[PDB]
Amino acid sequence: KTAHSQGIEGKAMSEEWARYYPRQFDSWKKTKESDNITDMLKEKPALVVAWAGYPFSKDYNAPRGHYYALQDNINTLRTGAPVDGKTGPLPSACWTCKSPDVPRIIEQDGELEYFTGKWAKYGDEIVNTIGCYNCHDDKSAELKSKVPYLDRGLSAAGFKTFAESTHQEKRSLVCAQCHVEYYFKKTEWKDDKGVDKTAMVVTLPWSKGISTEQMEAYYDEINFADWTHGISKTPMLKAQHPDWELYKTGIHGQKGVSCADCHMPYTQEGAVKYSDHKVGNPLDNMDKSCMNCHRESEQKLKDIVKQKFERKEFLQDIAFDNIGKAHLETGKAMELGATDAELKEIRTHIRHAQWRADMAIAGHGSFFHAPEEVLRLLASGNEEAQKARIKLVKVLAKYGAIDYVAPDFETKEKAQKLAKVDMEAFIAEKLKFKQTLEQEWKKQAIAKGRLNPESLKGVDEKSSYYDKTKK
Amino acid sequence: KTAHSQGIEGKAMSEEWARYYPRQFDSWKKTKESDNITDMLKEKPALVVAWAGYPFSKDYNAPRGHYYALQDNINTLRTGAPVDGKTGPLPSACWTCKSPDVPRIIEQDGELEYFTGKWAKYGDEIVNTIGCYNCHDDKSAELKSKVPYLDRGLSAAGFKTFAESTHQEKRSLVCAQCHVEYYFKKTEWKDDKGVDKTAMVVTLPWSKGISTEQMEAYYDEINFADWTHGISKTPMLKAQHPDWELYKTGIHGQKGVSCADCHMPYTQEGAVKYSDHKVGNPLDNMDKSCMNCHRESEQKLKDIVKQKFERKEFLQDIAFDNIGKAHLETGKAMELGATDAELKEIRTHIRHAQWRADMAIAGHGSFFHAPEEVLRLLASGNEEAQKARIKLVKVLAKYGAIDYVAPDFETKEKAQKLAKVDMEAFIAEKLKFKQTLEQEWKKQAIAKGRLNPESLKGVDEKSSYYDKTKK
Ligand code: HEM
Ligand code: HEM
Ligand code: HEM
Ligand code: HEM
Ligand code: HEM
Ligand code: HEM
Ligand code: HEM
Ligand code: HEM
Ligand code: HEM
Ligand code: HEM
Ligand SMILES: [Ca+2]
Ligand SMILES: [Ca+2]
Ligand SMILES: [Y+3]
Ligand SMILES: [Y+3]
Ligand SMILES: [Y+3]
Ligand SMILES: [Y+3]
Ligand SMILES: [Y+3]
């Protein structure tokens, strides 16, 4: 047994686990070191055009340390600026993979109630970031999945549930609670008080399998669309960090190497084994992350990975360039009078092209986890985009614009102008929210004892629209 | 020293090495077992359209055992039907990588003289297939490159020459004498008798590096073309088995694993080490070819390779389908009156598209040797093909044929009709050559003592146009 066999009071606050596991707590806290904000819309402006009419066209950055998950969820322009618990663009489900307070609330009010309402609904309740309670049982300390949607998805795909899985499998599944592709399923229900409510439930699109093509069929079957493209009016599908799905197809995954083997390597200290909880870039600690299975210069193994990234970059820029043009070209055809009937096939091609290319790059580590599947996906996506463009030339010609040249979008500024994103307005509105409602959420959380001010140190120094500079 | 330190009389005939190395001779002879003829034009008819106006549109099969190299060189419709030593479509250089008699003749008459004349010129001299003398010194038995063009290419690429290379490097370089991409360079010269002659010299296009892109620049720099496309009239480049070039970029090659490690694995017998000389498919002898570095089921490792092949097949069919259409679409534009000026950019795209896609698949093992580079190449080639097709739609529209649909070429028959290849005629002409001139070459070679009838056992049972069935 553990020294807390009856549970941990205040288990949602990771600082509560420190008295029992000082080592793991210390390394866990160090993800604070990965504080770099890389503006992906600035790096790859093509993404703005691809996501026109969707929140990702406003703000989308690379991931950083777990230490910042909760705050980045709050800072991103995607969550907008609620004025109370009933306003704001996004639903409560957006907290799901950002805090140990999520399973706390689910266990208190039930899954459906948790998935009911606006994101702003839990502003003063979900205030702790990725913590011990997200992956550990507070009585046994054993690995555990705290979200019901994972097993639900695993079963639907023919996989064993978390409890049915081996230990090595669990070392990757704890990650799969969040590092997977998903969609919100509108779900009607009635509470114990009889009132009718609508919940937006996190759902893993795995009922037909976990390959990109299988997930594609899954979405097409129910005619699902995350949004109607702001430019081409195409029924779009958004891929979101399908890290685990692509990892499973890669060689490492097929050979049984877990996420933890590379991101949370062990350090043996005479009979005692410790897992490095500083989840980050394995290439920064290759001796422990890689050289326990590989025998050769860290630099060469590093160079090899660098090569894979370049390959991915090459195909990525090609695919999204043609996807961007397809969108704009379709928008032009619309302006000239093209009918939805004349554009249906073109739109289906664009939908599939972006779904495949987005699935390939949405998982930032996929280029390494499953390099071959990534390249094949980008190639397949590009082909679908070009098929749409070839047909687009004819539609354009019919309407007298065969020589139309889609506008360029080589900078975030130009791309956002095409996507009609009024950044200044969104940022101004966001800051007002942060300076008012946000501070009230934190003050209330601290007063009620749900948040420890210590966890806020340096957590809000940066975002894509501001940088207080230092630490 | 060896038991033949002063050389081997009749060294070109591998049977002459048997008294000294019975083991190696026995396994070397067993490539006779790989006698399967796979008609690639039948399997991938798109290839016929791609090679319209070139010999490969007539006959192109997968490679088989070294035992059949010389005879397949004679059987392929590509070499046609000479009536004497001064007739026939191809030059003397076509023997180069098929026989140990090649270095024999080069060492006797000089490189330029060897590369001067028709293929038919040496019909009764080059009669032994891939043998000991192609890779071994007949005095020391050490590995050696017997063709000057290899070092010439290695140097030009900044690589060390064969003599300067390590032993492990030599275990791959002996293969690179033949398993590389090349082109024939028209070379003017004068013999010791003062007569002016023109030779077609095998040249490795490595002066700018060995990547596909570098080789592409190499060819474009000198405005080189292997042939003018029979359909699109595009200045085409033919990729030929760049096995070593792509292998060098793959992980195994980067890690120092030689061609021999997988294709000619060792078998330790108490202090004595023997190299399996039965060069073939490593997957048929995984225990010796792979499981000496890898530790897991042969079936899983086999399945993983099967997955790579499927990925390659997927992208290959897409790329060559669009390349085929581009060619046909260009041919249509020509019929309508499009000028060379209006088609120049389109043709450059097609040239580059096919060069990249052909380089990716011309090496039948590349999908495994360098899986990622193969996929990237097919993706890049497809993109170039689609860029050409997008521009082609506009040219077609200008000439009133925007709705033109390129004809299908899903069977070798239909594809060869489009490429205007009169198979029946070529085959009839070939058989007459085989029944007359060929038999005379062999009878004369046997009479002069250059060929041992034993080496002809079952060597001419199959081709792409006939199969005497059994052994
Ligand atoms: C499981 C052990 C697990 C792994 C592995 C994992 C990896 C991971 C990485 C490598 C990053 C980026 C780190 C960096 O850039 O320095 C990262 C980022 C996020 N993760 Fe994660 N993660 C694992 C588990 C979990 C779990 C259980 C959740 C969900 C509760 C989760 C969520 C996130 C979030 C959110 C981010 C983004 C952080 C930010 O940008 O603020 N991860 N993870
Ligand atoms: C709700 C739609 C939702 C929001 C909003 C949200 C935000 C968010 C941010 C701001 C980041 C940082 C990176 C960025 O700028 O985009 C981030 C990162 C990850 N998220 Fe998220 N997230 C929302 C929903 C979900 C859901 C339902 C899950 C879990 C199933 C989830 C998980 C993660 C993970 C993991 C990452 C890190 C890896 C990556 O590629 O970003 N998010 N999220
Ligand atoms: C939170 C600060 C936190 C604590 C505390 C904690 C403890 C803990 C222990 C005691 C172990 C076992 C011994 C060891 O160090 O290996 C352990 C192991 C793993 N943990 Fe953990 N852990 C904390 C947080 C987290 C979070 C946020 C996750 C999930 C993303 C997580 C995951 C893991 C994994 C995986 C292991 C290794 C499992 C194994 O190999 O048996 N921990 N943690
Ligand atoms: C398992 C399913 C698993 C998860 C989860 C995971 C996540 C993860 C993320 C989110 C990234 C991107 C981080 C970012 O900041 O962009 C990422 C990157 C890398 N990973 Fe990973 N990873 C999982 C599994 C594995 C395994 C099994 C290994 C080791 C073989 C591994 C390694 C890496 C590496 C390397 C990277 C890229 C580092 C870089 O180039 O910066 N991951 N992972
Ligand atoms: C650490 C982050 C790490 C790196 C770096 C790394 C690299 C690597 C490469 C380049 C390959 C080849 C396949 C490809 O190009 O995609 C590869 C293959 C295997 N690895 Fe690995 N690897 C890293 C970490 C680990 C760890 C911690 C293990 C051991 C549990 C491991 C194992 C393997 C295995 C097995 C393979 C499959 C191929 C094989 O060698 O049989 N790797 N890795
Ligand atoms: C070097 C040791 C070397 C290797 C490795 C190699 C491989 C190889 C394979 C795997 C095949 C196919 C075998 C089969 O299908 O069963 C094959 C085929 C040909 N090769 Fe080769 N080869 C090596 C060396 C050499 C050398 C030095 C030459 C040139 C003199 C050469 C040539 C060829 C030819 C020709 C073929 C095609 C045979 C046919 O289809 O008739 N190889 N080789
Ligand atoms: C001359 C232009 C020339 C001819 C003719 C020729 C023929 C030939 C045949 C018939 C095969 C069997 C496979 C097929 O049907 O195409 C074959 C195979 C290989 N060749 Fe060849 N070959 C010619 C020239 C050259 C030259 C100059 C070299 C060496 C630099 C060479 C090498 C090889 C190799 C190796 C193969 C096997 C691998 C493959 O992909 O076919 N050939 N050749
Ligand atoms: C021809 C029938 C032939 C003979 C005979 C022969 C002999 C031979 C010996 C004695 C060795 C060394 C001991 C061993 O078995 O490893 C050896 C090694 C290699 N050979 Fe060989 N060899 C014959 C033919 C060929 C041909 C056609 C090639 C080239 C394609 C070739 C290549 C090699 C290679 C490579 C080795 C291993 C080198 C090493 O690891 O030191 N041989 N052969
Ligand atoms: C080194 C430069 C090298 C050569 C030469 C070589 C050649 C070769 C050929 C011609 C093929 C295609 C054979 C056919 O009949 O289609 C081929 C195929 C495979 N090879 Fe190879 N190969 C070279 C090197 C290596 C190395 C280092 C390995 C082992 C890691 C290796 C393995 C294989 C495998 C596997 C195949 C594919 C088998 C199949 O799927 O049928 N080769 N090689
Ligand atoms: C035998 C023909 C053979 C097979 C099969 C094989 C497979 C294999 C795979 C699938 C990889 C992963 C990379 C990829 O997906 O492309 C891989 C990687 C390495 N191998 Fe291998 N391998 C075969 C043979 C051999 C032999 C004979 C050696 C040993 C000299 C060898 C070595 C390696 C090495 C090193 C790697 C690089 C990645 C790593 O594990 O560090 N392989 N192989
Ligand atoms: Ca999604
Ligand atoms: Ca060539
Ligand atoms: Y406590
Ligand atoms: Y990062
Ligand atoms: Y690979
Ligand atoms: Y003798
Ligand atoms: Y074969």
Q: What is the total count of domains within chain B?
A: 2
- Contact of B172 with chain A, judged by CB distance below 8 Å, is answered with no
Give B96-152 as a DSSP string.
TTT-THHHHHHHHH-HHHHTBSBGGGGTTT----S-HHHHB-TTT--B----HHHHH
> Minimum-distance ligand to the CA of B293?
10
Q: Within a domain: residue A466? A: no
Residue ending a domain, among B405, B421, B437, is B421
Domain membership flag for residue B129? yes
B218 and B339 in a common domain: no
CA B251 to chain centre: 23
| Nearest residue, CB atoms, A375 vs list B375, B382, B403 | B375
The closest of B58, B77, B52, B71 to B429, measured between CA atoms, is: B77
In a domain, A66, yes or no: yes
Name which residue sits closest to atom 29 of ligand 10, judged by CA.
B293
Distance CA(A280)–CA(B461), nearest Å, equals 62
Q: Alpha-carbon dihedral of residues A60, A66, A71, A76, nearest 10 degrees?
A: 10
User: What is the DSSP secondary structure assignment for residue A285, as one 8-state letter?
Assistant: S
Separation of alpha carbons A409 and A328, rounded Å: 10
Rounded to whole angstroms, how far apart are CA atoms A253 and B229?
45
Complete DSSP assignment for A291-340:
TTT--S-HHHHHHHHHHHHHHHHHHHHHHHHHHHHHHHHHHHHHHHT--H
**Residues A405 and A268 reside in one and the same domain:** no
Could you give the CA distance from residue B431 to residue B425 in angstroms, rounded to a whole number?
10
* Domain-located, residue B470: no
- Both B145 and B241 in one domain: the answer is yes
Cα B126 from Cα B438, distance rounded (Å): 12
Tell me if B131 is assigned to some domain.
Answer: yes
Q: Is the CB of A89 under 6 A from ligand 2?
A: no
Q: Which residues contact B295 (CB under 8 A, 6 or more apart)?
A: none
User: How far, in Å, is the centroid of ligand 4 from the Cα of B153?
Assistant: 40
- Report d(CA A417, CA A423) in Å as an integer: 9
DSSP A435: I
Taking every pair of C-alpha atoms in chain B, what is the biggest distance, in angstroms?
Answer: 77
Give A8 Cα–ligand 13 centroid separation in angstroms: 7
For residues B340 and B346, give the distance between their C-alpha atoms in angstroms, rounded to a whole number: 10
Looking at the structure, tell me whether residues B11 and B150 fall in a common domain. Answer: yes
C-alpha B421/C-alpha B433 separation (Å) is 19
Distance in Å, CA B464 to ligand 9 centroid: 23
Method: X-ray
CA A191 – CA A113 distance, rounded (Å): 8
The verdict on the CB of residue A61 being under 6 Å from ligand 2 is: yes
| C-alpha–C-alpha distance, residues A234 and A347, integer Å | 5
Structural domain contains residue A57: yes
Contact between B394 and A393 using a beta-carbon 8 Å cutoff: yes
Residue type, A182: Y
Cβ contact A314–B254 (<8 Å): no
Residue A374 sits in a domain whose CATH number is 1.20.140.10
Q: Closest ligand 9 atom to the C-alpha of B34?
A: 15
Tokens of B125: 């001299």
- Cβ–Cβ under 8 Å, residues A161 and A148: no
Does one domain contain both A252 and A151? yes
Residues of A362-375 as b/e, b for ≥16 C-beta within 10 angstroms?
Answer: bbebbbbbbbbbbb
CA distance A409 to A264: 39
Contact B389, B232 (CB under 8 A): no
Residues of A in contact with B254 (CB under 8 A): 300, 304
Strands B272-275 and A266-269: unpaired
Same domain? For A246 and A383 the reply is no
Cα(B69)–Cα(B22) distance, rounded to whole angstroms? Answer: 22
Q: Are residues A430 and A381 in the same domain?
A: no
Q: Which residue has the tokens 């669309």?
A: A225
- How far, in Å, CA of B440 to CA of B333, rounded? 49
Which residues fall within 8 angstroms of residue B146, CB to CB, at 6 or more apart? B102, B103, B106, B133, B134, B135, B177
Do B403 and B329 meet the contact criterion of CB atoms below 8 Å apart?
no
Query: Would you tell me which residues 349-408 of chain A have a C-beta closer than 8 angstroms to some C-beta of chain B?
Result: 371-373, 375-376, 378-380, 382-383, 386, 389-390, 393-394, 397, 402-403
Task: Give the separation between CA B96 and CA B108, rounded to whole angstroms.
Answer: 15
Residues within 6 Å of ligand 6 by CB = B 34, 63-66, 68-69, 72, 97-98, 130, 134-135, 174-175, 177-179, 259-260, 263-264, 279-280
Q: Give the pocket of ligand 3 (CB within 6 Å).
A: A 14, 17, 21, 24-25, 28, 130-132, 134-136, 141, 143, 171, 174-175, 260, 264, 273-275, 277
Based on the domain organization, do B234 and B332 belong to the same domain?
no
> What CATH number corresponds to the domain at position A197?
1.10.1130.10
State the distance from the centre of ligand 8 to the C-alpha of A393, rounded, in angstroms: 59
* DSSP one-letter code for B450: S
The closest-lying atom of ligand 2 relative to the alpha carbon of residue A76 is 10
The nearest CA of chain B is from the CA of A297 a distance in Å of 11
Q: What separation, in Å, do the N-terminal and C-terminal C-alpha atoms of chain A show? A: 40
Q: Are residues A312 and A436 in the same domain?
A: no
User: Residues A311, A411: one domain?
Assistant: yes
Q: Are A359 and A180 in contact (CB under 8 A)?
A: no
Q: In sequence order, what are the residues at sequence separation of 6 or more whose Cβ sits closer than 8 angstroms to the Cβ of residue B136?
A: B17, B142, B143, B144
CB pair distance less than 8 Å for B379 and A254: no
Whether residue B48 is found in the same domain as residue B158: yes
Residue of A nearest to B400 (CA): A397
From the list A204, A12, A226, the residue with the least C-alpha distance to A122 is A12
* B462 in a structural domain: no
Contact predicate A350/A323, CB 8 Å: yes
Nearest CA in chain B to A397: B397
Examine the domain organization and report whether B256 and B374 are in the same domain. Answer: no
User: Is residue A103 a part of any domain in this protein?
Assistant: yes
The Cα–Cα gap between B231 and B327 comes to 6
Sign of CA dihedral B114, B118, B119, B125: negative
Cβ-contact B58, B79 below 8 angstroms: no
Residues B332, A397: Cα–Cα separation, whole Å: 19
Q: Which residues contact B144 (CB under 8 A, 6 or more apart)?
A: B135, B136, B137, B162, B174
Residues spanned by the domain of B9: 1-279+422-457
Instruction: Give residue B110's region: left, alpha or beta (phi > 0; psi -120 to 50).
Output: left
CB contact under 8 A, B379 and A318: yes
Whether chain B has a CB inside 8 Å of the CB on A254: the answer is yes
